[PDB]
């Protein structure tokens, strides 16, 4: 469905219609480094914070998954990908939920757009 | 402080500056209603061309600066007559604080800078006399400290910088774990109350920060009550003005999808609060 790139340039997130999030590390392997299936419905968009090591996945289930993705340049340390929050209480209209998610350029603020015209500010 | 009366406005009350008699209320419609003590609007700003951001009167029935989204602050001389407009900020001026003693008044802008706009000394359409810079993020608000030559500045960088208008540089930048949204300096307690985005008001010692929680949403503005130096009200995004106490740090002492934006504390008029409700309420 959608992809985002870490500012370091060596990490990619793949948001898929298969309700899956694939973390690709360009020096790790051609296969996805991690595959995550927390979303219960089709995943629409994935966004990485340009500066902070935080990223989010917005799907049609109405839930936004906020994960902390930590990256070191050291080879011995694989990037640490951990869930941090499960944003809920967003309505789903015509089988369309959280369609787009955006990150604040500086701080950990989330711009989530729904199918009902609601823009939620997750601070 | 029981509520006295509410005065309606065309749009949400962006800025509030309560004096003994004059009460400046700048709204999102681009007008600055100079409400009297009873609530009679002496004059309203016209021809601004942009949504007003904040209001700050240098003296009652005198020059009163009103910042707008067009990065311009017009000084209306109270009916208010626009003597001069201070412009030159890269971004919109987030807030402006009036200085009666000094012609230079601080104004925090979204361009991560604080400009000291002067009534006559500004580089005139008047560039600020001292456009202080150094804040990593946009400067949310600026409030003059106990000394007229220093002013605390809170911004999105989570660092409250005590910028000296005489020197144009921040003497000390106190960093916190949350981005500060509002700044108000209390000279009686020699502290600076900063309302962060974490719905917490941190009273930091200018010479070290005591945090007080209880707000349902992010704090938008702060103002210490003249009647009680230990008491300070704080209007938050939950459309509530939580009046906390320095001694009673365990939550607000007495708190009074709307979102309160501006708060001022005048001795004669009490605590004036405004926000998304488009109604400036007064509590005496």
């Amino acid at each position: 469905s959608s992809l985002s790139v870490h500012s370091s340039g060596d990490h990619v997130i793949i948001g898929s219609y298969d309700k899956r999030l694939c973390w690709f590390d360009l020096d790790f392997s051609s296969k996805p480094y991690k595959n995550l299936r927390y979303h219960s419905r089709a995943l629409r968009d994935v966004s990485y914070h340009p500066s902070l090591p935080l990223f989010c996945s917005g799907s049609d289930d109405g839930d936004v998954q906020v994960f902390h993705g930590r990256v070191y340049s050291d080879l011995l340390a694989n990037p640490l990908i951990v869930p941090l929050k499960i944003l809920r209480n967003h309505k789903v209209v015509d089988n369309v939920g959280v369609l787009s998610t955006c990150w604040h350029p500086k701080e950990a603020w989330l711009f989530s757009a729904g199918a009902g015209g609601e823009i939620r500010m997750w601070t | 402080p029981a509520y006295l009366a509410s005065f309606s406005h065309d749009d949400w009350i962006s800025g509030i500056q309560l004096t003994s008699d004059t009460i400046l209320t700048s709204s999102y419609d681009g007008i600055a209603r100079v409400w009297d003590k009873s609530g009679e609007i002496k004059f309203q700003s016209t021809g601004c061309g942009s949504s007003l951001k904040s209001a700050s009167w240098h003296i009652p029935n005198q020059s009163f600066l009103t910042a707008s989204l067009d990065q311009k602050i017009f000084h209306w001389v109270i009916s208010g007559i626009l003597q001069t407009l201070f412009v030159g900020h890269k971004d919109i001026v987030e807030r402006v604080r009036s200085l009666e003693s000094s012609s230079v008044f601080i104004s925090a802008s979204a361009d991560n800078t604080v400009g000291i706009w002067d009534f006559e000394r500004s580089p005139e359409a008047r560039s600020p006399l001292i456009l202080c810079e150094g804040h990593t993020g946009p400067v949310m608000d600026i409030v003059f400290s106990d000394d007229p030559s220093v002013a605390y500045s809170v911004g999105q960088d989570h660092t409250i910088k005590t910028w000296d208008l005489i020197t144009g540089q921040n003497v000390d930048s106190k960093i916190t774990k949350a981005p500060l949204l509002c700044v108000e300096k209390l000279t009686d307690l020699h502290l600076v109350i900063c309302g962060s985005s974490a719905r917490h008001i941190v009273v930091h010692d200018p010479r070290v920060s005591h945090t007080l929680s209880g707000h349902k949403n992010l704090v938008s503005g702060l103002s210490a009550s003249p009647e009680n130096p230990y008491m300070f009200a704080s209007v938050s995004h939950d459309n509530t003005c939580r009046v906390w106490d320095v001694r009673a740090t365990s939550g607000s002492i007495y708190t009074i999808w709307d979102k309160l934006f501006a708060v001022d504390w005048n001795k004669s008029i009490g605590i004036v609060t405004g926000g998304t409700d488009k109604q400036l309420q007064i509590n005496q």
Binding site: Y17, R41, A42, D60, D94, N95, V96 | -
Partner: protein, 134 residues
Amino acid sequence: KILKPGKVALITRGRFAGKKVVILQAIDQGSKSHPFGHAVVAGVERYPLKVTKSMGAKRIARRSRVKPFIKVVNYNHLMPTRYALELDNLKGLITADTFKEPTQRSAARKTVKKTFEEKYQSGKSAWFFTPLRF
């Protein structure tokens, strides 16, 4: 005009060759993404298995489960038939956007499944639900 909504046709090319489908909506004029006379159809991929009076209820349900599929097919690849299927509850669910966002495609597949299940239980369109042997 013989390719009308509600008409049973046979897919002759593609993965679902020889499967019986019902014309869900005809766009014979064409489209930007499909410059030909296409028509979106809903059909059966796994036909329900044959049932016997001796079978117990659990297996009767187990065999009666049907796996549907929705596909846009070219007119040249469709073989229209005389049979017609009454597509109740299945009038407005398919649109270009329903294919663009697979969440609507997944919802359409589920609704098509439950309609086919109920129609099969009702015992209507016996020819539509029996597999074509070739």
